[PDB]
């Protein structure tokens, strides 16, 4: 299954108001290609910046055998 | 939630009717009241925290035991929680005044109030007493202010009283 290796930082927007424990907003992730669009859109809407992304698993332009 | 316009629309759509003369009349009444609704909401927003603080400072004198031992606001923690509930009541009453309908009141306030308060052991009578105290303060302040129309303000608080109040009779 083709998957993306993404490096992104997503600083919180409601930590001050909610008073919750901090988490490292910078992370490297192996995200499925199916969920990658939703994950990237959520990251952009959250306000964080994705610094690096790549297709870790899979061959570019593959027509069959995605799964 | 549904305001007056949306509840009228839903009511007419139930029968599958076009908006008739009575619908236009009710809409006109709400739209003309909207100025006073916005005015009252602005005033309550201006004096919100003071209103709740004064309402508590009257309610704990009406029923003094809520701050003495075995009372439900005994700690500062309990006191702050009680004032938070009072602030919630005021904010949702303001929302209901602007919306001209108590369904926004019901969906977000009353639908489980007795269950939650019984589970926490909170009294269900002193809370409505404080609600009425807030309503009295709000309407007195509105009457003092230059609010031509103020009758609608008693509707949300009185609906809260009727819903969350035990059926004595």
């Amino acid at each position: 299954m083709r998957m993306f290796r993404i490096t992104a930082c997503v600083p919180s927007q409601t930590r001050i108001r909610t008073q919750r424990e901090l988490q490292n907003t910078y992370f490297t992730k192996l995200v499925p290609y199916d969920n990658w669009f939703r994950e990237q859109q959520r990251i952009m809407k959250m306000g964080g910046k994705i610094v690096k992304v790549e297709l870790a698993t899979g061959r570019p332009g593959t027509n069959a055998g995605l799964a | 939630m549904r305001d007056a316009v949306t509840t009228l629309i839903k009511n007419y759509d139930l029968t599958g009717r076009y908006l008739d003369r009575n619908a236009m009349d009710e809409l006109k009444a709400y739209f003309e009241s909207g100025s006073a609704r916005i005015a009252a909401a602005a005033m309550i927003n201006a004096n919100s925290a003071t209103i709740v603080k004064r309402a508590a400072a009257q309610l704990f004198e009406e029923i003094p035991e809520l701050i003495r031992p075995s009372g439900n606001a005994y700690t500062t923690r309990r006191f702050s929680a009680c004032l938070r509930d009072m602030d919630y009541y005021l904010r949702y009453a303001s929302y209901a005044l602007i919306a001209a309908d108590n369904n926004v009141l019901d969906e977000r306030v009353l639908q489980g109030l007795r269950e939650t308060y019984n589970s926490l052991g909170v009294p269900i009578g002193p809370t409505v007493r404080g609600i009425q105290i807030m309503k009295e303060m709000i309407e007195a302040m509105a009457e003092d202010s230059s609010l031509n129309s103020t009758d609608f303000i008693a509707s949300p608080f009185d609906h809260m009283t009727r819903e969350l109040s035990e059926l004595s009779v």
């Binding site: - | 700690t75 923690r77 019901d106 009353l110 639908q111 489980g112 007795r114 269950e115 939650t116 019984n118 589970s119 926490l120 009727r162 819903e163 969350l164 059926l167």
Partner: protein
């Protein structure tokens, strides 16, 4: 009033924390027997009791 009800069940918020409550809570939350650290807490607190 309301035309339904979720159902009222008793809630038990903790008013404040004591050492025994803290240790028991940690062990119960982690699904463990009281280990050496919690046992030392309990013993020292009982001695100073």
């Amino acid at each position: 009033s309301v035309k339904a009800s979720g159902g009222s069940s008793l809630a038990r918020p903790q008013l404040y924390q004591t050492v025994p409550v803290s240790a028991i809570s940690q062990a119960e939350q982690q699904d463990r027997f009281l280990e050496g650290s919690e046992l030392n807490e309990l013993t020292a607190y009982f001695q100073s009791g």
